[PDB]
């Protein structure tokens, strides 16, 4: 056990910092700024296809 020596270590600060990001995107006008698709064909996420 390996019951609380790691659970106090890693398993507790997971929920706190994820709350600090879900309460962050709706407030700050620049959230995560993820880039473009980089897609060579045309796929089902769009309606058209490419050869």
Partner 1 sequence: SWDKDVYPEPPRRTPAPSPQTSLPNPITYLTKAFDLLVDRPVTLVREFIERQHAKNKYYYYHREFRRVPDITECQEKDVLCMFEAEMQWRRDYKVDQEIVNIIQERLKACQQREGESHRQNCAKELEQFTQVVKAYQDRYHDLGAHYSARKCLAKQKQRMLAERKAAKEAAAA
Partner 2 sequence: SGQELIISNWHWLTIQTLKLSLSFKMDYFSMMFIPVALFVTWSIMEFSMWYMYSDPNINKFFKYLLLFLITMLILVTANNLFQLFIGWEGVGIMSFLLIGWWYGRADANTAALQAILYNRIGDIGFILAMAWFLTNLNTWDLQQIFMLNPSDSNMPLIGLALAATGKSAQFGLHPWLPSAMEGPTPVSALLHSSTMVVAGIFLLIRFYPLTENNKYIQSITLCLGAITTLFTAMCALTQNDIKKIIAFSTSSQLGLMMVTIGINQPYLAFLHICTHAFFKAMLFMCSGSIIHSLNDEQDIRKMGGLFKAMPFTTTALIVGSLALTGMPFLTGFYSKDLIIEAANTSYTNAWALLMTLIATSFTAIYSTRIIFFALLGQPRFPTLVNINENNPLLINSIKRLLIGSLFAGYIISNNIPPTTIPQMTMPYYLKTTALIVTILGFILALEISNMTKNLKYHYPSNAFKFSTLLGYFPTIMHRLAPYMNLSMSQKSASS
Return residues touching partner 1 (CB under 8 A): 14-15, 18-19, 22-23, 26-27, 29-30, 33-39, 43-46
Q: 43 with 49: CB under 8 angstroms?
A: yes
Q: Is 30 among the residues that bind partner 2 (CB under 8 A)?
A: yes
Q: Does 40 bind partner 2 (CB under 8 A)?
A: no
Position among 2, 28, 40, 50 found at the interface with partner 2 (CB under 8 A):
28
Number of residues lying near partner 2 (CB under 8 A): 10
- Helix (H) or strand (E) holding 19, with range, is helix 13-25
Distance CA 21, CA 47 (A): 33
């Amino acid at each position: 056990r390996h019951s609380i020596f790691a659970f106090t270590h890693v398993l507790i600060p997971v929920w706190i910092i994820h709350y600090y990001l879900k309460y962050h995107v709706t407030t700050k006008p620049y959230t995560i700024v993820e880039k473009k698709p980089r897609i060579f064909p045309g796929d089902t996420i769009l309606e058209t296809g490419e050869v």
